[PDB]
Design an enzyme around this catalytic site. Sequence first.
Site, PDB file in Angstrom:
ATOM      1  N   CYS A  54      40.762  54.629  48.151  1.00  0.00           N
ATOM      2  CA  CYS A  54      40.179  54.580  47.135  1.00  0.00           C
ATOM      3  C   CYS A  54      40.400  56.640  47.455  1.00  0.00           C
ATOM      4  CB  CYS A  54      38.805  54.284  46.526  1.00  0.00           C
ATOM      5  SG  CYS A  54      37.895  53.778  47.826  1.00  0.00           S
ATOM      6  N   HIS A  94      33.232  57.653  43.861  1.00  0.00           N
ATOM      7  CA  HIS A  94      33.169  57.877  44.923  1.00  0.00           C
ATOM      8  C   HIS A  94      33.174  59.832  44.151  1.00  0.00           C
ATOM      9  CE1 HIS A  94      33.614  55.201  47.061  1.00  0.00           C
ATOM     10  NE2 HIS A  94      35.384  54.985  47.276  1.00  0.00           N
TER      11      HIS A  94
END
Lengths: 357, 356
Positions: free
Chosen positions: B127, B251
């Site tokens: 990710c 994130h």
Amino acid sequence: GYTVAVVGATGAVGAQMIKMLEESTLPIDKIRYLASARSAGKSLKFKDQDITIEETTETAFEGVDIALFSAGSSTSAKYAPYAVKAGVVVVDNTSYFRQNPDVPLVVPEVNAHALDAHNGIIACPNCSTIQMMVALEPVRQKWGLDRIIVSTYQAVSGAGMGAILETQRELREVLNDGVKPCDLHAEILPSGGDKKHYPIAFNALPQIDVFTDNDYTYEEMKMTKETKKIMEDDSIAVSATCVRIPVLSAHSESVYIETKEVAPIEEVKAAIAAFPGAVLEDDVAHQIYPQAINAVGSRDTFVGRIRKDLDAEKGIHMWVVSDNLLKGAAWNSVQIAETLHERGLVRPTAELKFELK
Amino acid sequence: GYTVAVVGATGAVGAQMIKMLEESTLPIDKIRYLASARSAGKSLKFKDQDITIEETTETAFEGVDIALFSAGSSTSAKYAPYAVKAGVVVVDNTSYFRQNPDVPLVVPEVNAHALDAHNGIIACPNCSTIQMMVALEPVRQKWGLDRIIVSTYQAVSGAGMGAILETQRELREVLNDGVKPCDLHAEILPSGGDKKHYPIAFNALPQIDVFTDNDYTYEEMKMTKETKKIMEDDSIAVSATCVRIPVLSAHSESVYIETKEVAPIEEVKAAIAAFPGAVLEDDVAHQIYPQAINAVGSRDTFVGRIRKDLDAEKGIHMWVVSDNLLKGAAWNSVQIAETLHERGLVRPTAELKFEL
């Protein structure tokens, strides 16, 4: 012993100052508490005794040897020069006097020698700067420092009691009331001064303080300028990104440096271990590293995740944590006062170098 | 059209996989769901229809054109090589095939051309790596890349559903019950595959995944090794610090680069704005920058705080945010399946390169 005044005694900020003073080795004969006209007459503790709060005025500093300021910029700008006029030595908590060339900007483990030539005011640095200096100093004095790149993970207590309460309320609204983070109403963060406010709950806000003309924030620029002055080397390249995260107390920093000569990691670890105010917490085999929640309540600065860069032969990464209200503020201030006494430097200044207002 | 299978539909790595499939441009005739015998008889919705869950076996893949894996590394390791044999084109989310030179490692906006030589398996990257590539690729192709230094602020959903719940339990305990965060009991974070567990509530944990022999974590090493493979350039220097913070989704990354030639910031912004998959959120006068909470639910990668380094003339700092379950995982996987369809690459494999 000394007559000591705490200026801005009533805040949450003052309370940490008081606690650090209560546990100090400083010989204290008399304590005085100074605050706004609103608080004058009230009672706060110093150890076993009830101290009556007095109003901070131009004439309130007579017979004071040491004044620890723990209020805001305007209080310092107005009253510090009067304190110096009265013969006081001032330890200021704010950014106000930090970049003044007549004012030493001090972390006692790093540049206590700068205290020797003070002109009545010594400035405590920014909290995020302070913990970085404790961690990096032992490295610098053996291997030098060419540059620093830092990314911070700052706690909301650095923005005051209101910011803490904002964070707790927002989190309860999410977890207890089912409000979506993006639906929250904020009043303080990222910056009480600035025009817009955003939720901190389940968020990360890359803004601490307001923006300056070059697109870095004041917080980031303070990290740049203060480092240069504390380590007395304008040639140290420093650039920072300062981020607020949902932590109540203790700042963490991801720190990259390049030294002036290759610094063996084993020795870097050992030099930090042996450095006053620093604690090596580095044993990745047992997942040992500084953690914000473990740092709270402690005066120490904790260092770990120390490792060589993968490509730059002089590059070193590390992880640095410290309680932003102790070593980041109140402890560094009280420690400056202890160090002034230790070096025989608590004395009236003959010449005033700061204008009255 | 296509028969498409979702392996590991039962997890919440498959939850977002399904939602991205429902809104896909992919011509789907039959949708199939695969998992273990633990649930091989229940029902799950695709759009509005109800789908029978079948058991993941060695011969369950016949007649399937594309399989999107969203289970564990062990499921991929055993069941993906059978899917290739059967005739399927595999898009794998896990790390297991990422460093195999027979497996293309793709973020479609960045290296779509790597899909052309695939051997039945395409790997979706980590990710944190994905969002960084979308942000930096527009900069690399105009001005080059010499090095990257990155510090991440990673959300807990990256570590699974159990991590999200642990985080909520912990925060509820602090706030409602009066428990000190240092006194919280933890069972999952920082890593389910590691020995000790620490609370994430009001904390920041400089450990994601387990530690390797060079004192970086596997997550940190992924960002390094994967960047090299995606941008097809081993000379790009990459070091990472990966940190878990108390955020459920999305994130954030503090990214520092040094380019090969000087890139004016103004131009840097325009290049990022014009790059597909990336949105410029950069207006400090009105305090506009990427935020995790705004990014949740969006396929885009948000970039802002863009500014010159104060001393390194080729140095640039920036702030990058993206939903880790979308562009960080599910969306990237679906997008790869979409891109394989646009490029004429959804067909059985000529030669089998992974052992049965």
